[PDB]
Design a protein around this ligand. Structure first.
Ligand SMILES: [Co+2]
Ligand SMILES: [Co+2]
Ligand SMILES: [Co+2]
Ligand SMILES: [Co+2]
Ligand SMILES: [Co+2]
Length: 466
């Protein structure tokens, strides 16, 4: 059987979709520790989102499944007679799941706390992390999109997938000839809008485009949306995720009967205050829970926020430099050889990252036996599973095959980069694998990755459903 498996993979790797592409492929039997297959396992390649694997493991080691994040509201001293206060500070400490609901819940506490007026200014404190919003080598052209959202300690998360630093932009068609109707979602009143979009005739081509011009906090909409066209929605990042959290909290307070006479702005709690009053606070779910949405949908904001949290825990510094070193350290304490590893960021978006298929499998074996093995493997996306929170970025892959609901693996794709690394649980042996492709020029070789994952699932003792 073994010999057949090897030949089969060699054949699959013969796909023309992998021309001019270096591919690191490693397969190992977790149980026996046997090396079922290996090709360029020591070759340094860009891992794309697969990099999140290393960040996720590091997070469990340094923060732990138990870990959770907090958000506070503080005044110099509690309110009194007329229930007034001067400056109010919204302090974020890395919660990547802070919803607008959470903010409203807090706006309520501040009110129940006896506050009716914020005579001073309302400040958003995100100093828990540095202000380095984007990784040095991230392409500025990717900035308008969610996966490239600015990183901040205080940031609001959209939806149940917790997309940070973004706002939801909607474009609804009007009558042919009339301007299209644009809604900026949360960023309303915060970001500037330049709506040049127009309703085209019914049946006309949809040429609409939503964008945030680099270096601005403006949502520019151009193009034409046909009248008979279904309203469009999109996620666009904003500048200074904190200034937005402050804006929404500003609106949350007002909604909870608390007036704010000042202005919303960035700024940390004076430190001059020996006993600031904590009018309100929120605590997120534990890391083990937050891991799911992070890994299932591959959330870059979460990965980066995690690195800096690790930087805070290991060195008291929400910095990529600190966190990254902390990640590399943690991986070592886990028994992983970080020799051919190069960490430039936590999400894998950075072209500066480098790993080797061997290192990945290495991290898979170790992680597989660590105390948090369960919560860990449970965050990985499962092959061909409709439910988004289970299938993740693999919901629409390998369906109706031996891998369906069997292969647990992290995906990762960029131009010329693609990877699929994970586990293949089975009666014929517990398998760990890694596939990293760099160099291909057409689309990502996802069918090749699947083909291999499906053959492995079979080798592990699984049959396609009928
Ligand atoms: Co902890
Ligand atoms: Co949504
Ligand atoms: Co608003
Ligand atoms: Co929460
Ligand atoms: Co099966």
């Amino acid at each position: 059987r073994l010999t057949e498996l090897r030949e089969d993979i060699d054949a699959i790797l013969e796909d023309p979709a992998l021309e001019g592409a270096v591919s690191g492929v490693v397969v190992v039997d977790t149980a026996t520790g046997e090396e079922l297959y290996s090709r360029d396992g020591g070759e340094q390649l860009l891992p794309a989102s697969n990099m999140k694997l290393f960040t996720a493991a590091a997070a469990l080691e340094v923060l732990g499944a138990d870990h959770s994040f907090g958000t506070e509201v503080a005044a110099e001293s509690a309110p009194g007679r007329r229930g007034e206060v001067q400056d109010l500070y919204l302090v974020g400490r890395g919660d990547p799941t802070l919803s607008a609901e959470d903010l409203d819940a807090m706006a309520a506490e501040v009110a129940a706390s006896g506050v009716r007026t914020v005579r001073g200014d309302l400040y958003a404190d995100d100093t828990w992390f540095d202000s380095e919003r984007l990784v040095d080598d991230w392409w500025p052209e990717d900035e308008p999109y969610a996966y490239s959202a600015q990183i901040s300690a205080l940031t609001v998360a959209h939806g149940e997938r917790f997309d940070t630093g973004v706002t939801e932009v909607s474009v609804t068609p009007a009558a042919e000839g009339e301007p299209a109707d644009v809604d900026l979602g949360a960023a309303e009143g915060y970001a500037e809008l330049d709506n040049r979009a127009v309703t085209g005739a019914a049946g006309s081509a949809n040429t609409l485009v939503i964008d945030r011009p680099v270096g601005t906090n403006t949502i520019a909409v151009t193009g034409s949306l046909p009248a008979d066209a279904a309203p469009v929605t999109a996620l666009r990042t904003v500048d200074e995720p904190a200034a937005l959290a402050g804006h929404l909290f500003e609106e949350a307070l007002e909604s909870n009967g608390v007036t704010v006479k000042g202005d919303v702005g960035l700024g940390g709690v004076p430190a001059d205050w020996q006993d600031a009053e904590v009018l309100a606070d929120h605590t997120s779910a534990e890391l083990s829970e937050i891991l799911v949405p992070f890994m299932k949908f591959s959330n870059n904001g979460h990965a980066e926020m995690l690195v800096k949290s690790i930087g805070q825990e290991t060195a008291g510094a929400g910095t990529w430099d600190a966190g990254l070193v902390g990640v590399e350290e943690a991986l070592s304490g886990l028994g992983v050889d970080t020799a051919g590893l190069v960490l430039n960021d936590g999400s894998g978006l950075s072209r500066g990252n480098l790993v080797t298929a061997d290192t990945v499998v290495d991290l898979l074996g170790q992680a597989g036996s660590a105390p948090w093995a369960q919560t860990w493997s449970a965050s990985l996306p499962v092959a061909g599973e409709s439910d988004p929170f289970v299938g993740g970025t693999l919901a629409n892959r390998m369906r109706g095959t031996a891998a369906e609901g069997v292969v647990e693996a992290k995906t990762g794709t960029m131009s010329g980069v693609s990877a699929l690394s994970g586990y293949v649980p089975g009666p014929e042996g517990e398998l760990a694998f890694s596939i990293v492709n760099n160099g291909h020029s057409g689309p990502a070789p996802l069918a090749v990755q699947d083909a291999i994952a499906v053959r492995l699932a079979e080798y592990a003792g699984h049959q396609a459903p009928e």
